Amino acid sequence: GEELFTGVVPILVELDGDVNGHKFSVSGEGEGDATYGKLTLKFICTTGKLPVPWPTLVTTFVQCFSRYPDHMKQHDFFKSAMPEGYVQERTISFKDDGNYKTRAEVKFEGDTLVNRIELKGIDFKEDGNILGHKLEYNYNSGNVYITADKQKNGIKANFKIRHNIEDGSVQLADHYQQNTPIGDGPVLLPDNHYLSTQSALSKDPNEKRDHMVLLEFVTAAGI
Ligand SMILES: [Mg+2]
Numbered sequence: 421g422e423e424l425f426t427g428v429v430p431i432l433v434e435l436d437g438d439v440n441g442h443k444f445s446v447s448g449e450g451e452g453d454a455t456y457g458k459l460t461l462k463f464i465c466t467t468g469k470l471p472v473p474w475p476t477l478v479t480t481f482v483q484c485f486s487r488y489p490d491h492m493k494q495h496d497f498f499k500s501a502m503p504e505g506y507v508q509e510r511t512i513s514f515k516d517d518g519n520y521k522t523r524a525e526v527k528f529e530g531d532t533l534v535n536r537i538e539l540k541g542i543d544f545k546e547d548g549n550i551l552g553h554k555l556e557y558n559y560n561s562g563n564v565y566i567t568a569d570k571q572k573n574g575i576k577a578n579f580k581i582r583h584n585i586e587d588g589s590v591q592l593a594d595h596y597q598q599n600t601p602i603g604d605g606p607v608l609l610p611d612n613h614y615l616s617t618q619s620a621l622s623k624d625p626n627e628k629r630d631h632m633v634l635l636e637f638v639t640a641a642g643i
Contacts, residue, residue, distance in 0.1 A: 421502040422496060429485075431452050431485075431532065432532055432533075433535045434536050434537065435481065436538050439539070439540075440541060440544045442472075444468075445465070448463035454487060456487060458637055460634070462624065471551070473557075474632040475556075475559055475583055479510070480524070481535070483498045484533065485533075491643070492640055498599075500607045501603065502533075505525060505526050505527025505603070506602055507524070508599045509597065509598050510598075513593070513595075514593050515591065516548070517549065518548075518550065520540070520541045524538075550591075556586050558584055562581060563579060564614055564617060565577060565579055565614045568611070572600045574609075579595045616641050618637045
């Protein structure tokens with residue numbers, strides 16, 4: 421599995437979303453270089469204006485590109501599932517507001533790594549920080565805590581994303597995640613550890629569509 425990640429790998433992301441009945445789709449393209457834990461992706465909302473803030477979708481939009489140091493490579497679930505792939509599911513609970521439920525399939529289509537996602541958001545406040553677009557266009561560094569789920573032959577993750585609000589405050593987004601292999605081949609079930617993430621959001625000056633440019637670095641640690 422990890423053999424598939426020693427070079428630059430093209431990535432496609434496709435999402436269909438419904439948040440409070442606002443229906444939207446996003447298509448993303450870019451590439452990943454797991455040797456450096458590095459992702460570069462550009463996302464376009466193909467249905468018009470995105471009805472939630474872009475930063476709220478960053479985690480939903482390929483942890484197989486994390487850099488696992490050599491001494492921790494026996495703990496890399498994500499690459500071990502490839503090329504058949506894994507299902508990734510989350511509940512993202514926005515404090516004092518609604519939640520996203522997401523289901524994705526991450527797998528190779530030929531030599532390309534594809535993340536296909538369905539997102540459902542409910543019980544959002546009409547002018548809370550998400551539907552009122554009060555979140556700043558930036559992103560904080562943070563840790564993703566991974567644990568094995570032996571019974572599902574997979575992993576769980578639990579973590580907190582803090583989204584900066586334009587008034588200086590923070591919108592917490594609690595993340596609960598489960599991943600399970602799609603293939604029947606053996607996978608790596610890791611000891612407890614975490615992914616240390618860093619993410620930078622930007623705009624393409626020549627792009628008039630609603631979009632997001634993402635540069636991310638992710639390194640495994642904690643062992
Ligand atoms: Mg501030």
